[PDB]
Design a protein around this ligand. Structure first.
Ligand SMILES: Cc1cc2c(cc1C)N(C[C@H](O)[C@H](O)[C@H](O)COP(=O)(O)OP(=O)(O)OC[C@H]1O[C@@H](n3cnc4c(N)ncnc43)[C@H](O)[C@@H]1O)c1[nH]c(=O)[nH]c(=O)c1N2
Ligand SMILES: Cc1cc2c(cc1C)N(C[C@H](O)[C@H](O)[C@H](O)COP(=O)(O)OP(=O)(O)OC[C@H]1O[C@@H](n3cnc4c(N)ncnc43)[C@H](O)[C@@H]1O)c1[nH]c(=O)[nH]c(=O)c1N2
Ligand SMILES: O=S(=O)(O)CCS
Ligand SMILES: O=S(=O)(O)CCS
Ligand SMILES: [Mg+2]
Ligand SMILES: [Mg+2]
Lengths: 489, 518
């Protein structure tokens, strides 16, 4: 279908994408052909075009934007929203406007499926009409100059879900993030088994638990290693366990038992305390994504690239080059490859970036944890909420938007959140920041920039805080910055 | 007088004790926390231990000076925990959650919403407000090493002399931090039962309001409380004296906010002045009569909320000290927070607008630094700002029309885009707007945001956001913008997708061009 001279609206695009199928054909020599039009390929194309170069995107999906809108970040955020709202409803069940509190997993997945063509339509419309891009969609993509001829290739095919080499892994009722939003044709029973212990497993597991299902996470090593501050990690894990989640470390699935109809009936796992069998008809695999890869490859199948994103005229970007598999990495690697193709030699080594994951809370972190900073030899002070006292977490701070009910409810104050900054006592520089609650994720983007510039506790204290703020760092810093001899709070 | 100096109560013990003192029929004991073994003179006595006095004391003590806080409240922190910022946020949380529940009424886990008790939420606040009070007393004494006398009005004798708890204290300076009182209306029936302000709402609500609420004013307070009252299921009429939400300078952002308020059922009346509050034979409000641009209006109601500007508490102190006052009763100060009276500073809401926590705390600290010999000026402006409706509304810098009127060639980067589909598209979207983004016919509710950029310098001139989870970000973003942030530098940050503000990645989408395009 030649839609080059066809100007459809966002919602007309959404409809056409749902309908599709025919190849969507929207077409100087090409400076680069992008193999894949996800975050890396789409942003790389946008930047290359904006620089005045010629680009072509070829993707097997009939929409641009890749996994993010179809089965990754967007559905994850919808599920995390549900997890947080459901924790609130269950905590205040039968109080105020809250009714007596099992949420239908399939209805939420079906809501996502019914609405995901909105973002698809925005992607196709914005890419064609506003970003001036050429693309061929709903078509899978010869040599380092041939696909169409181009001066360079930029490989941006992403990564695929990790698999498990155990009997029963293909049983009906085993899902990953990709298949959950394509093949869920029943409502899961009362138990969920989640395999894995990092972001995807924890985010989806907290959603399943929030729907009212007994949720058992089988973690190969130790959960949430990305949270380096020990107290922050312990708060996050403690709140997950209080919600009823069961986290079993050092455990490996031995087999997924199939019933006579081919459906999951149980998971058998080895743990440090021996073998256990969990009855379930629903298993979610939250394992690491695997790059879709004469290129030199790394140990995990990632395509090897130098600091200019060049492989062994062929660049590679995004999840295809391995961790960190985040949207900032995919989009920046795509743009930087495009700039190098267009003659602007610029290196990219992702380092000292902010990070985040969802449980029933938003969990934001950057820089050093407290113990990590001390083990590196720093005199450190910490400024945190709640304070270290005999009352512990059972006090009405920290408190901000979407945490006030916890702060004021009977016996719920410990759920109002946790946060901390780690400060070098000699330089007065902020070395790390950590937050559990809501509404700080966005701030950590900009805070990390200030910290990379050399932010001190005095400079933090001298800012204008928008009370009551998700992060209390500004004013709590101001309470201590008047002393040349810094003291923790 | 309770000599508390050598008692070391926990946070929760403080919460209980403050509750007891606040409920004592005889007013309760004076809380006396003075280091009677320290021979040093007081560098400053703070009249008031709210945000300004408490932070000023903390900073002065941290610098090595001696301070003495004297407040009439049995707790530190002032209006913020007791009847201002804290209860406000509690109510705004409720307003946002209730808009969500009403939008998805009878779907997923949500109950059928086709009237929430205002009194039970206020009672919840009253039952839990001692927690913050306890932390304030505990942090101030055990962590910040502050001296204070609470549950005792201060009696200023002169510019170096103050009486408290039957004793006279001398100080090198006074720092006045008594704040402001609720604004009132000079109309017949204003003292009727059923007429409340932010202070009286959390102390005197002994009944559950009826189906209609009349809010007087267009302040942040008026809009914040109004949205909460509307969200409980009540017809809510706002009587704005001038034009609503003038603080939102960007016309597009303001229009989005107002449109969403009206979609929730709020009636916003501009150019309006209450002429009388009608009382029934029981002494309770039965109606509000107001002059509007469309003539006289009479609204039947048994519940009126006044959200007028706060009035600096300057009268007594100006008589005793001879302080120069401004037209609204604010205490006049130079840029070092010095009043007209030697060795007397004034801070916080007492010095007038802007009446914000950052202003109160920073003015307290800068006064303290000047007292301690560090000449430092404080003139607040180019600060970020926010308010609640059923959404969080965040803004800094220039609106689009304001930037053009100031002579800038500008481009804008916004979500949703200007297309035939308008707001009815699934962006912007992030935490706490995903249901709106995906729901049947609710996409327009997923928010609105815009940055304003100078087309020549590429500098970001202003930022505006309606949604959730960007308020905290605007604190740090404003600093970066005051440093001279360009669209290129913004594009080069690390975003945390899906982000409340999409500014980073959308900037990156346009930053590749020499000639910027919206
Ligand atoms: C469940 C879950 C949740 C999240 C995340 C991942 C997952 C699995 N991520 C990570 C994020 O999704 C990831 O980093 C980016 O989507 C990677 O973008 P790429 O463009 O590299 O791959 P991506 O997979 O997006 O794009 C690859 C594209 O190439 C196409 N393709 C593949 N093979 C092809 C062929 N042979 N021919 C043509 N086309 C082909 C595919 O169709 C696809 O469109 C994330 N990150 C984040 O920052 N925040 C978050 O909240 C989350 N959340
Ligand atoms: C309803 C509402 C909602 C909000 C806000 C205000 C209001 C009214 N504010 C503004 C904020 O509350 C205000 O700017 C600060 O609390 C001002 O702090 P001060 O210390 O100046 O006065 P504050 O009023 O807090 O303190 C004055 C203290 O002096 C004491 N005092 C008075 N007379 C005395 C006497 N004779 N002797 C001894 N002590 C005496 C009082 O007891 C009181 O403790 C706000 N700001 C913001 O930044 N974000 C927000 O969300 C909100 N929300
Ligand atoms: O990064 S992309 O804009 O392509 C997809 C966002 S869901
Ligand atoms: O600013 S204070 O910490 O004094 C009160 C906050 S509610
Ligand atoms: Mg707490
Ligand atoms: Mg929208």
């Amino acid at each position: 279908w030649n839609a080059r001279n066809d100007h459809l609206t966002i919602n007309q695009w959404a409809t056409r994408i749902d309908e599709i199928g025919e190849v969507i054909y929207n077409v100087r020599e090409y400076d680069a052909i992008f193999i894949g039009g996800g975050a890396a390929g789409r942003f790389g194309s946008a930047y290359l075009r904006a620089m005045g170069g010629r680009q072509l995107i070829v993707d097997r999906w009939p929409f641009l934007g890749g996994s993010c809108p179809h089965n990754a970040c967007v559905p994850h955020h919808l599920f995390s929203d549900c997890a947080a709202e459901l924790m609130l409803a269950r905590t205040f069940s039968g109080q105020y406007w809250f009714p007596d509190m099992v949420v239908g997993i399939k209805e939420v997945v079906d809501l996502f499926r019914a609405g995901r063509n909105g973002p698809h339509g925005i992607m196709n419309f914005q890419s064609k009409e506003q970003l001036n891009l050429e693309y061929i969609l709903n078509c899978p993509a010869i040599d380092n100059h041939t696909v169409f001829k181009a001066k360079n290739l930029i490989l941006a095919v992403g990564a695929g879900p990790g698999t498990l080499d155990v009997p029963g892994v293909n049983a009906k009722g085993v899902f990953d993030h990709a298949t959950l939003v394509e093949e869920l044709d029943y409502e899961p029973g009362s138990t969920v088994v989640v395999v894995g212990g990092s972001k995807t497993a924890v985010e989806y597991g907290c959603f399943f638990n929030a729907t009212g299902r007994r949720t058992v996470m089988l973690v190969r090593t130790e959960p949430l290693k990305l949270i380096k501050d020990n107290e922050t990690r312990a708060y996050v894990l403690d709140r997950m366990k209080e919600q009823g989640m069961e986290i079993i470390s050092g455990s490996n699935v031995t087999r997924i038992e199939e019933d006579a109809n081919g459906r999951v009936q149980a998971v058998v796992a080895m743990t440090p305390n021996g073998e256990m069998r969990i009855e379930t008809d629903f298993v979610f695999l939250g394992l690491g994504e695997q790059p879709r890869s004469g290129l030199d490859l790394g140990p995990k199948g990632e395509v090897l690239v130098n600091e200019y994103l060049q492989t062994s005229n062929v660049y590679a970007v995004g999840d295809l080059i391995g961790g960190p598999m985040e949207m900032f990495k995919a989009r920046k690697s795509g743009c930087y490859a495009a700039r190098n193709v267009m003659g602007e030699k610029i290196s990219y080594t992702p380092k000292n970036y902010p990070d985040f994951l969802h449980t029933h809370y938003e969990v934001s972190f950057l820089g050093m944890g407290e113990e990590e900073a001390r083990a590196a030899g720093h005199e450190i002070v910490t400024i945190k909420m709640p304070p270290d006292t005999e009352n512990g977490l059972n006090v009405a701070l920290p408190a901000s938007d979407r945490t006030m009910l916890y702060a004021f409810g009977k016996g719920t104050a410990h759920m109002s959140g946790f946060q901390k900054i780690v400060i070098d006592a000699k330089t007065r520089k902020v070395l790390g920041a950590h937050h559990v609650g809501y509404g700080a994720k966005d701030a950590f983007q900009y805070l990390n920039v200030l910290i990379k510039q050399g932010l001190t506790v005095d400079e933090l204290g001298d800012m204008d805080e928008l009370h009551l703020n998700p992060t209390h760092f500004i004013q709590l810093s101001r309470l201590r910055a008047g002393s040349k001899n810094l003291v923790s709070l």
